């Protein structure tokens, strides 16, 4: 199966980073795309077979290699801020049908000091809702992170829930007029009243932040905003 690594990446301007794509299907064709707003998918490079590489619609600022039918490493030569995109990798045994990967969210920043981790907090259902609607809605808020490399999940009694969950499709700019503004995200989990009324049940909101790596230098005093998980929990009340 096609898989990508990394899945998220914050690099500095002018640096050289290489995104990897590994496939076990022994497919002959592989492709690297970049999906932005208004342009759809755009081919950067692709490879008909091993030791064969050709250019696509957006081949400037990138190079590529393919010495084996397994790996098709896309490599940014010098990272420009215009290269902040979502990079997708595909493969084909016998085209046209392609099998895409999970994607890679790359964020090219000028200085890594703008990278901040998220602050997560859980907000408990209001009694007015439990009386009027006989249902309980918990609100989770994740504020002050940058860039938007987050994955919010809900955990009830140690299991991850999806029913009754709703996360905002896009994050809010805390400083809307800033291009490097920090982001905020909200999500909701609606459970039946008598479930929240039981104090034996546990609710947790979890945010997986994909930040800096243990190799990215950090000269500031603030703690290094590395990839981390910031959580917030709550217990049922009667």
């Amino acid at each position: 199966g096609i898989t990508q690594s990394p899945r998220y990446k914050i690099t500095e301007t002018g640096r050289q980073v290489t995104l990897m794509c590994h496939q076990t299907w022994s497919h002959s064709y592989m492709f690297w795309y970049r999906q932005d707003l208004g342009h759809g998918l755009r081919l950067i490079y692709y490879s008909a077979a091993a030791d064969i590489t050709d250019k696509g619609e957006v081949p400037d600022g990138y190079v590529v290699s393919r010495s084996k039918t397994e790996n098709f490493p896309l490599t940014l030569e010098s990272a420009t801020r215009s290269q902040t995109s979502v990079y997708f990798c595909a493969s084909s045994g016998v085209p046209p049908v392609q099998f895409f990967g999970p994607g890679t969210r790359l964020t090219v920043l000028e200085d890594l000091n703008k990278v901040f981790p998220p602050e997560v907090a859980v907000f408990e259902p209001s009694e007015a809702e439990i009386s009027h609607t006989q249902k309980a809605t918990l609100v989770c808020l994740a504020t002050g992170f940058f860039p938007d490399h987050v994955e919010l999940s809900w955990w009830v009694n140690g299991k991850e829930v999806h029913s009754g969950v709703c996360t905002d499709p896009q994050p809010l700019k805390e400083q809307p007029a800033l291009n490097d503004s920090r982001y905020a995200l909200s999500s909701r989990l609606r459970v039946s009243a008598t479930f929240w009324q039981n104090p034996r049940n546990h609710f947790r909101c979890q945010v997986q932040f994909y930040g800096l790596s243990e190799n990215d230098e950090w000269t500031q005093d603030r703690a290094k905003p590395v990839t981390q998980i910031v959580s917030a929990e709550a217990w049922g009340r009667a």
Binding site: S28, Y29, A48, A49, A50, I52, D54, T69, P95
Partner: peptide, 10 residues
């Protein structure tokens, strides 16, 4: 045809 090379690879 770059895929002709891919044919021989197959």
């Amino acid at each position: 045809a770059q895929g002709a090379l891919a044919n021989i690879a197959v």
